[PDB]
Amino acid sequence: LTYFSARKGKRKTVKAVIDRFLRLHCGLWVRRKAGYKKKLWKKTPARKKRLREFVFCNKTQSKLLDKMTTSFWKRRNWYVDDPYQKYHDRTNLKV
Template sequence: MLSLLKNAAGLLSAPSISSSVIGARGIARIPHWEYHIRMDNKVGKKRVAQDVLDRFKRLNNGMWIHARPGKNKQRYMKDDHFQETSLYYETCTKRECEMLDKMMTPFWLQKRFYVDDPYKNYQVRHGLDSPRVDAKGHFIRERSKILMDDTTSLKYFKDR
């Protein structure tokens, strides 16, 4: 019994993994859920996060949109309301937009214009080209609040 305890104590005190095996935390070992800025070793410049380009779309007004989470998961089990609303896009918060901008290079932050743009409805913000918050994060009213019928709004506002 005593020899078993000495053997177990020896196993516990011996390092199971040498320090040479545990390397520095390289780019390949960073978990995908952490927000980080990748650098290119050859050029020495910031590298874009491909996950952001795949999952998000940057609008010309600086806001980012993304598809609703779980929009394609088990659609047969969801109700009709979810079937309709799952096809909509969601806008990111101010903090998320700033974070996503930091993960992009200036090339991807430029305004882009396409023929028959499917995101045309999301691009228009009644003449504003910035998000609806000021530097302090307070909501800014785009225009004075008015009530009007659809024909008048279609006549004066070309956002539909």
């Protein structure tokens, strides 16, 4: 991911991670199950509903996605009409 560039000497990110995932401020990444739009005629409606759900990642996957990004993608955005605004803060956490 180029730890040191040749012009600015900073850290670069992977645009695939940004285009395929979505990081929340709490420290979770929202992904999408693969195969949710292809070959939907041989799958049961239960599987079709399960594939169309925002599934969270794990620990090592979240750590990898954080290491592949810089400090810009780990901030807090205040959009006007953000459907994921209620998922940024995570309350009721006891270790």
